[PDB]
XYZ file of C-alpha atoms in Angstrom:
559
model
C -40.089 3.019 -168.573
C -41.615 1.799 -171.337
C -39.105 -0.190 -174.108
C -38.171 0.639 -177.706
C -40.224 -1.657 -179.939
C -37.767 -3.624 -182.136
C -39.531 -2.634 -186.041
C -37.830 -4.544 -187.664
C -38.522 -7.751 -186.547
C -41.999 -6.803 -185.223
C -42.998 -6.569 -189.914
C -40.546 -9.390 -190.320
C -43.554 -11.175 -187.776
C -46.062 -9.690 -189.979
C -44.615 -10.974 -193.754
C -43.953 -14.346 -192.172
C -47.661 -14.869 -191.128
C -48.545 -13.664 -194.228
C -46.559 -15.744 -195.837
C -47.367 -18.806 -193.986
C -50.960 -17.976 -194.885
C -49.993 -18.502 -198.435
C -48.551 -20.617 -198.454
C -49.381 -23.062 -195.070
C -47.470 -26.043 -196.479
C -43.938 -23.991 -196.852
C -40.895 -23.863 -195.086
C -39.682 -19.532 -196.361
C -38.026 -17.620 -193.303
C -38.569 -14.048 -193.988
C -36.481 -11.713 -194.847
C -36.836 -7.866 -193.619
C -34.847 -4.947 -195.200
C -34.299 -1.826 -195.498
C -36.215 0.011 -198.532
C -35.024 3.167 -200.778
C -36.350 5.826 -198.529
C -37.721 7.276 -201.699
C -39.944 4.784 -201.875
C -40.564 3.580 -198.662
C -38.903 2.421 -195.012
C -38.565 -1.171 -195.420
C -38.667 -3.645 -198.124
C -39.424 -7.998 -198.331
C -38.559 -9.907 -200.823
C -39.342 -13.385 -200.294
C -41.897 -13.639 -203.128
C -39.032 -13.546 -205.492
C -37.746 -16.199 -203.805
C -40.448 -18.843 -203.652
C -41.751 -17.573 -207.321
C -37.920 -19.290 -208.427
C -38.542 -22.023 -205.985
C -42.374 -23.383 -206.620
C -42.956 -20.154 -209.308
C -44.189 -23.007 -212.093
C -44.872 -25.424 -210.474
C -48.015 -23.063 -208.503
C -49.355 -21.842 -212.091
C -47.793 -18.056 -211.097
C -47.674 -15.761 -214.257
C -44.508 -13.763 -212.123
C -43.358 -13.078 -209.105
C -45.197 -10.098 -208.542
C -48.506 -12.043 -208.026
C -46.943 -14.031 -205.581
C -46.420 -10.360 -203.725
C -49.696 -9.403 -205.087
C -51.206 -11.840 -202.644
C -48.800 -11.622 -199.625
C -49.908 -7.858 -199.485
C -53.387 -9.157 -199.792
C -52.963 -11.197 -196.928
C -50.997 -8.215 -194.982
C -53.764 -6.332 -192.473
C -52.328 -3.236 -190.688
C -53.077 0.025 -189.887
C -49.372 0.942 -188.952
C -48.370 0.720 -192.634
C -49.560 4.019 -194.686
C -48.177 2.281 -197.757
C -47.853 -1.255 -199.002
C -46.641 -1.480 -202.863
C -45.329 -4.286 -204.704
C -42.785 -4.079 -207.518
C -42.497 -5.959 -210.883
C -39.208 -7.833 -209.465
C -41.516 -8.415 -206.927
C -40.444 -7.568 -203.621
C -42.578 -5.109 -201.200
C -42.014 -2.178 -199.751
C -43.854 -0.515 -196.901
C -44.461 2.367 -194.905
C -44.686 3.512 -191.613
C -47.873 5.638 -190.637
C -47.154 8.990 -189.163
C -49.920 7.949 -186.425
C -47.543 4.622 -185.805
C -44.708 6.381 -185.084
C -45.685 9.581 -183.528
C -47.524 7.544 -180.950
C -43.594 5.011 -180.688
C -42.071 8.230 -180.312
C -44.499 9.375 -177.433
C -44.200 6.581 -175.641
C -40.061 7.750 -175.444
C -41.284 9.621 -172.499
C -40.668 8.273 -169.043
C -43.219 10.544 -167.131
C -41.520 13.949 -168.218
C -37.928 13.727 -169.266
C -37.126 11.689 -172.062
C -36.257 7.609 -171.104
C -34.413 5.786 -174.241
C -34.510 1.815 -173.282
C -33.895 -2.040 -175.089
C -35.050 -4.973 -173.747
C -32.328 -7.670 -174.660
C -35.786 -9.724 -174.707
C -36.668 -7.883 -178.250
C -34.449 -7.557 -180.160
C -33.320 -11.281 -180.008
C -34.048 -15.069 -179.960
C -35.747 -16.506 -176.713
C -33.480 -19.650 -177.138
C -30.781 -17.206 -176.934
C -29.222 -16.711 -173.560
C -27.096 -13.139 -172.764
C -27.215 -13.879 -169.194
C -23.497 -13.259 -168.645
C -21.586 -11.959 -171.617
C -17.703 -11.660 -171.746
C -15.571 -9.622 -173.388
C -11.783 -10.110 -174.221
C -9.775 -7.163 -175.348
C -7.016 -4.504 -175.444
C -4.566 -7.797 -174.596
C -1.287 -5.621 -173.978
C 2.183 -7.747 -173.031
C 3.991 -6.728 -170.238
C 7.702 -5.278 -170.904
C 6.310 -3.834 -174.254
C 5.248 -1.108 -175.694
C 1.270 -0.801 -176.610
C 0.802 -0.589 -180.144
C -1.557 0.863 -182.386
C -3.115 -2.923 -182.940
C -3.834 -2.638 -178.919
C -5.090 0.628 -178.876
C -8.054 -0.386 -181.877
C -8.696 -3.375 -179.800
C -9.070 -1.446 -176.926
C -11.732 0.677 -178.599
C -13.504 -1.852 -180.194
C -14.180 -3.838 -176.841
C -14.880 -0.678 -175.234
C -17.458 -0.635 -177.730
C -18.686 -3.176 -177.243
C -19.147 -3.394 -173.607
C -21.160 0.195 -173.318
C -23.842 -1.574 -175.775
C -23.836 -4.478 -173.017
C -24.245 -2.550 -170.362
C -26.478 -0.554 -171.814
C -28.522 -3.804 -172.710
C -28.179 -4.314 -168.655
C -26.515 -7.157 -169.192
C -24.553 -8.826 -166.944
C -20.862 -7.713 -168.616
C -17.563 -9.327 -167.471
C -14.718 -6.713 -169.472
C -11.195 -8.810 -169.662
C -7.831 -7.677 -170.461
C -5.775 -10.838 -171.058
C -2.417 -9.445 -170.481
C 0.482 -11.341 -171.573
C 2.074 -11.759 -167.885
C 3.748 -14.602 -168.639
C 6.074 -14.547 -171.416
C 9.627 -15.520 -172.889
C 11.303 -12.526 -171.790
C 11.281 -12.679 -167.746
C 13.896 -15.072 -167.569
C 16.360 -12.090 -169.412
C 15.082 -9.513 -167.286
C 15.570 -10.706 -163.851
C 18.683 -12.291 -164.825
C 19.575 -8.425 -165.856
C 17.847 -7.462 -162.802
C 20.131 -9.489 -160.140
C 23.306 -9.724 -163.224
C 23.558 -6.182 -162.186
C 21.438 -5.151 -159.043
C 22.146 -7.278 -156.613
C 20.352 -5.399 -153.941
C 17.060 -6.127 -155.962
C 14.894 -7.501 -152.923
C 15.953 -4.462 -150.450
C 16.192 -1.454 -153.538
C 14.846 -1.663 -157.116
C 16.685 -0.375 -159.955
C 14.492 2.042 -162.446
C 11.035 0.424 -163.610
C 10.821 3.831 -166.134
C 12.932 1.880 -169.244
C 11.619 -1.485 -169.725
C 11.258 -1.296 -173.138
C 14.638 -0.502 -173.034
C 16.072 -3.116 -170.394
C 13.862 -4.896 -172.332
C 15.875 -5.133 -175.725
C 19.433 -4.902 -173.159
C 18.558 -8.780 -171.707
C 17.637 -9.415 -175.286
C 21.093 -8.859 -176.607
C 23.041 -9.419 -173.562
C 21.477 -13.227 -173.738
C 17.027 -19.385 -168.549
C 17.550 -21.213 -165.089
C 15.743 -18.077 -163.633
C 12.406 -18.475 -165.584
C 12.483 -22.287 -164.938
C 12.850 -20.840 -161.732
C 9.873 -18.353 -161.970
C 7.578 -20.897 -163.189
C 8.556 -23.030 -159.514
C 7.113 -19.718 -157.752
C 10.627 -18.765 -156.070
C 10.470 -16.350 -153.688
C 13.018 -13.230 -155.288
C 11.953 -14.699 -158.894
C 8.520 -13.864 -158.004
C 8.703 -10.949 -156.308
C 10.862 -9.675 -159.550
C 8.374 -10.674 -161.798
C 5.474 -9.018 -159.668
C 7.820 -5.745 -159.840
C 8.023 -5.884 -164.075
C 4.158 -6.520 -164.525
C 3.345 -3.340 -161.586
C 5.561 -1.166 -163.914
C 4.132 -2.167 -166.999
C 0.533 -1.749 -165.582
C 0.910 1.554 -164.308
C 2.724 2.711 -167.340
C -0.408 0.575 -169.284
C -2.865 2.235 -167.489
C -2.344 6.151 -167.814
C -3.225 5.159 -171.617
C -6.839 3.914 -169.946
C -8.144 6.083 -168.057
C -7.248 8.798 -171.021
C -9.365 6.780 -172.911
C -12.227 6.630 -170.317
C -11.244 2.936 -170.211
C -11.794 0.346 -167.346
C -11.079 -3.516 -167.661
C -9.982 -5.725 -166.085
C -6.676 -8.027 -165.468
C -6.902 -11.518 -166.245
C -3.071 -12.439 -167.548
C -1.533 -15.674 -168.436
C -0.290 -16.135 -165.346
C -3.765 -16.467 -163.468
C -4.483 -19.698 -165.363
C -0.933 -21.605 -164.696
C -2.290 -22.904 -161.800
C -4.931 -24.866 -163.275
C -3.150 -25.456 -166.809
C -2.594 -29.412 -165.664
C -6.014 -29.270 -164.508
C -7.486 -28.534 -168.208
C -5.255 -30.816 -169.741
C -6.329 -34.063 -167.224
C -10.057 -32.849 -168.184
C -8.890 -33.017 -172.454
C -7.227 -36.295 -171.527
C -9.588 -38.702 -170.031
C -12.187 -36.626 -172.831
C -9.999 -38.821 -175.845
C -10.239 -35.060 -177.909
C -6.925 -35.344 -178.121
C -4.015 -37.137 -180.599
C 0.354 -37.014 -180.898
C 1.883 -35.450 -183.005
C 5.704 -36.022 -182.777
C 6.701 -36.495 -178.763
C 3.249 -33.033 -178.464
C -0.365 -33.589 -177.763
C -2.830 -31.607 -179.556
C -5.886 -31.297 -181.070
C -6.482 -32.097 -184.492
C -9.610 -30.420 -185.986
C -11.371 -31.935 -189.314
C -12.137 -28.546 -190.361
C -9.307 -26.990 -189.334
C -5.898 -28.536 -190.950
C -3.394 -26.429 -188.207
C -3.996 -28.466 -184.908
C -3.586 -26.700 -181.030
C -0.461 -27.562 -180.028
C -1.866 -28.464 -175.909
C 1.153 -30.533 -174.121
C 4.999 -29.882 -175.252
C 7.338 -33.282 -176.034
C 9.225 -32.316 -173.072
C 5.640 -32.651 -170.540
C 5.306 -29.055 -170.000
C 2.236 -26.867 -171.336
C 1.854 -26.050 -175.179
C 1.558 -22.432 -176.842
C -2.414 -23.671 -177.288
C -3.259 -24.694 -173.456
C -4.140 -21.181 -172.131
C -6.256 -20.234 -174.639
C -8.277 -23.372 -173.626
C -8.028 -22.887 -170.341
C -8.850 -19.060 -170.066
C -12.210 -20.636 -172.265
C -12.813 -23.883 -169.802
C -13.281 -21.148 -166.872
C -15.094 -18.590 -168.360
C -17.879 -21.644 -169.143
C -17.600 -23.442 -165.948
C -16.451 -20.823 -163.356
C -18.103 -17.833 -165.045
C -20.983 -19.180 -166.188
C -21.081 -17.016 -169.290
C -23.471 -17.397 -172.692
C -21.272 -15.440 -174.571
C -17.654 -14.617 -175.289
C -16.419 -12.726 -177.394
C -12.707 -11.859 -178.672
C -11.466 -8.898 -180.138
C -8.160 -9.640 -181.852
C -6.284 -8.740 -185.169
C -7.958 -10.748 -187.808
C -5.193 -12.943 -187.969
C -5.651 -15.213 -185.354
C -9.403 -15.800 -186.654
C -8.603 -19.835 -187.516
C -6.501 -19.782 -184.152
C -9.652 -18.833 -181.965
C -12.314 -20.611 -184.288
C -10.128 -23.619 -183.837
C -10.527 -23.500 -180.023
C -13.993 -23.327 -179.711
C -14.394 -26.030 -182.584
C -12.068 -27.778 -179.605
C -14.578 -26.578 -176.994
C -17.767 -27.339 -178.456
C -16.790 -31.093 -178.394
C -16.742 -30.571 -174.556
C -19.506 -30.319 -171.912
C -17.300 -27.447 -170.557
C -20.892 -24.817 -169.405
C -23.491 -23.639 -171.577
C -23.508 -25.522 -174.607
C -25.055 -23.207 -176.267
C -22.731 -20.438 -175.418
C -22.009 -18.022 -178.398
C -18.728 -17.986 -179.366
C -17.738 -15.197 -181.496
C -14.315 -13.631 -182.951
C -14.293 -10.011 -183.525
C -10.824 -9.377 -185.303
C -9.670 -5.902 -186.879
C -7.109 -4.842 -189.322
C -4.160 -3.162 -189.252
C -3.642 0.573 -189.215
C -1.250 1.920 -191.143
C 6.299 5.124 -181.241
C 4.214 5.629 -178.637
C 0.742 5.732 -177.483
C -0.205 8.570 -175.439
C 2.481 10.796 -177.193
C 0.528 9.955 -180.068
C -3.315 11.070 -178.474
C -1.024 14.342 -177.209
C 0.257 15.669 -180.412
C -3.797 15.106 -181.938
C -4.277 16.978 -178.472
C -2.182 19.442 -179.656
C -3.962 19.719 -183.198
C -7.317 19.930 -181.750
C -6.394 22.922 -180.003
C -5.095 24.442 -182.725
C -8.344 24.032 -185.047
C -10.276 25.235 -182.090
C -8.384 28.386 -180.671
C -7.875 29.074 -184.970
C -11.555 28.821 -184.656
C -12.278 30.742 -181.663
C -10.031 33.291 -182.836
C -13.742 34.860 -185.110
C -16.972 33.163 -172.744
C -14.241 30.601 -173.438
C -11.976 32.262 -170.891
C -13.802 30.200 -167.997
C -12.860 26.352 -169.724
C -10.718 24.141 -168.838
C -9.114 24.288 -172.729
C -6.231 21.549 -172.341
C -9.399 19.233 -170.836
C -12.030 19.596 -173.469
C -8.996 19.499 -176.435
C -7.671 16.320 -174.982
C -11.346 15.026 -175.022
C -11.496 16.309 -178.482
C -8.965 14.604 -179.401
C -9.725 11.425 -177.701
C -12.841 11.538 -179.331
C -12.254 12.222 -182.865
C -10.060 8.855 -182.574
C -12.308 6.723 -181.336
C -15.438 7.627 -184.258
C -12.579 7.951 -187.119
C -11.775 4.286 -186.264
C -14.827 2.365 -185.124
C -16.268 4.031 -188.157
C -14.725 1.853 -190.195
C -15.787 -1.455 -191.051
C -13.072 -3.508 -188.521
C -11.780 -5.800 -190.346
C -10.864 -3.189 -192.945
C -7.688 -1.564 -192.948
C -7.150 1.905 -192.641
C -4.889 5.886 -192.297
C -4.345 6.911 -189.220
C -4.210 10.307 -189.955
C -5.009 13.454 -187.935
C -5.871 15.717 -190.662
C -8.854 13.530 -191.782
C -9.994 12.645 -188.534
C -9.516 16.534 -186.942
C -12.161 17.584 -190.020
C -14.899 20.019 -188.621
C -15.806 19.391 -192.084
C -16.028 15.767 -193.059
C -17.159 12.739 -191.448
C -15.587 12.983 -188.528
C -15.546 12.950 -184.625
C -15.052 16.194 -184.200
C -18.645 16.817 -186.814
C -20.343 14.637 -184.642
C -19.686 17.088 -181.874
C -20.504 19.736 -183.257
C -23.423 18.732 -184.273
C -24.867 18.123 -180.892
C -23.541 21.392 -179.521
C -26.302 23.310 -181.525
C -28.379 20.811 -180.764
C -27.995 22.342 -177.336
C -27.339 25.928 -178.082
C -31.063 25.074 -179.894
C -32.318 24.994 -176.542
C -30.702 27.437 -174.707
C -31.274 30.212 -177.061
C -35.587 29.020 -177.074
C -37.722 31.218 -174.741
C -40.332 28.101 -174.005
C -38.958 25.648 -171.372
C -38.889 22.176 -173.297
C -40.523 20.553 -169.801
C -43.772 22.619 -170.302
C -44.414 20.402 -173.277
C -46.262 17.353 -173.083
C -45.645 14.487 -175.467
C -49.268 15.453 -177.604
C -47.374 17.589 -179.050
C -45.660 16.072 -181.260
C -46.985 15.895 -184.891
C -44.641 15.146 -187.980
C -46.540 17.482 -190.572
C -43.075 17.024 -192.948
C -41.342 14.632 -194.785
C -38.444 15.381 -193.106
C -40.392 15.691 -189.692
C -41.331 11.697 -190.527
C -37.982 10.609 -191.732
C -36.731 11.929 -188.929
C -39.214 10.063 -186.555
C -38.078 6.831 -188.014
C -34.222 7.301 -188.284
C -35.137 7.748 -184.604
C -37.704 5.003 -184.166
C -34.708 2.110 -186.056
C -32.150 2.156 -183.103
C -33.532 -1.421 -181.942
C -32.821 -3.168 -185.562
C -28.296 -1.556 -184.416
C -28.870 -3.540 -181.425
C -30.283 -6.268 -183.383
C -27.873 -6.960 -185.647
C -24.969 -5.522 -183.590
C -25.750 -8.847 -180.833
C -26.340 -11.165 -184.332
C -22.311 -9.716 -186.028
C -20.330 -6.689 -184.339
C -20.159 -5.223 -186.390
C -20.105 -1.684 -184.599
C -19.891 0.659 -188.053
C -23.023 0.210 -188.345
C -24.159 1.837 -185.034
C -21.493 4.952 -186.111
C -22.934 5.374 -189.445
C -26.684 5.333 -187.399
C -24.918 8.535 -185.507
C -23.901 9.850 -188.570
C -26.801 9.293 -190.364
C -29.307 10.647 -187.597
C -27.333 14.153 -187.787
C -27.705 14.518 -190.943
C -31.255 13.255 -191.082
C -32.010 16.458 -188.545
C -29.685 18.739 -190.172
C -32.385 17.863 -193.102
C -35.631 18.105 -191.157
C -34.162 21.652 -189.767
C -32.676 23.246 -192.889
C -36.840 22.729 -194.379
C -38.392 23.373 -191.104
C -36.901 26.513 -189.525
C -38.434 28.802 -191.914
C -42.262 26.989 -190.332
C -44.546 29.768 -188.232
C -44.791 29.451 -184.737
C -47.968 26.938 -185.098
C -45.865 23.541 -184.543
C -42.329 24.778 -182.082
C -43.224 22.917 -179.100
C -43.164 19.529 -181.620
C -40.449 20.664 -183.587
C -38.365 21.438 -180.141
C -40.207 18.331 -178.734
C -37.875 16.090 -181.868
C -35.004 18.181 -181.144
C -34.794 16.703 -177.456
C -35.602 13.307 -178.311
C -32.724 13.654 -181.309
C -30.358 14.832 -178.292
C -30.065 12.274 -176.219
C -30.484 9.964 -178.928
C -27.388 11.736 -179.914
C -25.538 11.944 -176.534
C -26.068 7.805 -176.549
C -25.199 7.228 -179.424
C -22.226 9.141 -178.663
C -21.124 7.857 -175.522
C -21.782 4.159 -176.626
C -19.087 4.490 -179.022
C -16.642 6.331 -175.683
C -16.797 9.763 -177.066
C -17.786 12.381 -174.864
C -20.593 15.196 -175.842
C -19.775 19.005 -174.803
C -22.774 21.243 -174.853
C -21.259 24.339 -174.765
C -18.954 24.987 -178.721
């Protein structure tokens, strides 16, 4: 129940206090990064900026002297080493004892419990009481595409991150269930199936009938907007069918989220517009009522020339709802990078209202293009993974469902290969690249995990007979593994700030290689520190499992 310290913030504070002591009347926020591992663990560069700003003034000959003054005002036993540099940055190494003691905190009684209090990775002014993540966003009667998939994967990872941090997290799918098409389609369904109400036609081929309707050809749309019994009946049937189709995909991915479509906001739109009209933030462009930001050229269109609802009214209403009715403290929109401006323009409007928490953190999480049915794409992947797997086995598994295992491997692989990319970057969808057991792949990560479990299956010692105090980091590799493990909170600290989850994938990858370096170099020692090594293996396993799960992967123990 004792939670990991955030080391970057700890060290940042130590340097901040030394800087303040050195230069009492200075405004200089300490910044802490990682050092080159060959030379240190962490690093602070503020002496360089202090020298550039005030250097000639305070009669210092160079930046290094400033860094030496800063060092002279630091007194910490947790630093094994602290050193300046000719450029003037400062590097530190954590002591063996700090790392060992910190690692020993990871044991709740006798089992490993990795936990992180969000209070320790944020500023105390920052509130994460209620977080909402808006992601996936398919459209009824349209095929889900690879962009939807990416949004689904990213969004689910972010949610899992907040759920790990024990945050009240709203998983919200803003489905397009109130669009243009519903007229056309609804026409066809009764221009071709009169007995619609008593017996509905086949909805198994909705995406086809969709164009069909587009080809053949509007009273039905306005009649739907006026809550006619039959049109609503048909609409509801369409939405239900498409949602079943979407749900097959979602639970193949093991991702749950709540349908809250455009339709959901329709009965409050006039209220929202009324509010905006009373706020006097809107203007007239043509016969339309819009919001013109000072900071963005393209206005939000909120009311049309007809008097009908503008195509930007739904997004504004949804944020109104999330802020005032769900009391959201953070709202995250996971979408194509090209919608960025749009959402920034929305945030700019919402910040000018009195709606909900004025300090609400509004975030756009953009993603690039991936360069056709999702479920068959994944089943193709499954076939490939199974092929590679059986081919590997060729050189007990008769008691394993190879199909489920293959699908798990594929799904995990897809998720990792996507999340390891910078979200804002485009990338090449390739089964060859993503299923390569040798590459930087989800498959690789998985086999690393199963190897680490294999160690515990094959050892003659019960890991649960070992007390935490066996732990002794005697090699540079055990030190390095310990360090990397204790860096885990830094990942969350930065994710909360920029939502770049590839940093987590990276972290995870590094965990595996660091671990490997441990193994390869300690595998030839005698039994004297064996128990401590096993303990390190146990912690590493726990952490790898957790990392995998946070990214939506499923650890497999035996392979």
